From Swiss-Prot:
Protein's job: Contributes to protect body fluid from freezing at subzero temperatures. Lowers the freezing point of the hemolymph by about 2.5 degrees at a concentration of 1 mg/ml. Binds to nascent ice crystals and prevents further growth.
GO cellular component, one term: extracellular region
Keywords in alphabetical order: Antifreeze protein, Disulfide bond, Repeat, Secreted, Signal
Family the UniProt entry places it in: Belongs to the insect antifreeze protein family.
Shown residues in whole-protein numbering: 29 to 112 of 112
Stated name of the protein: Thermal hysteresis protein YL-1
Binding partners and assembly: Monomer.
Amino acid sequence: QCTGGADCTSCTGACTGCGNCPNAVTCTNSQHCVKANTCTGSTDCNTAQTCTNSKDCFEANTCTDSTNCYKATACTNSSGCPGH
């Protein structure tokens, strides 16, 4: 269709397995959800409010299976969250 694989930087919707998006609001997985409202099993999460395996969950309230949870509330097996 447009977003499916490991390369986007083309569509302007939601990314689901690419690695590089333009102005998408969110992305499901991959590595390029920095300016997204919500990053799941991905990374770059400074604008979003949560993650599920992102290595940049700074402004995230929930982060499971991720690391570097700059100020988190719920953390189990993640890094940068309540524990360090």
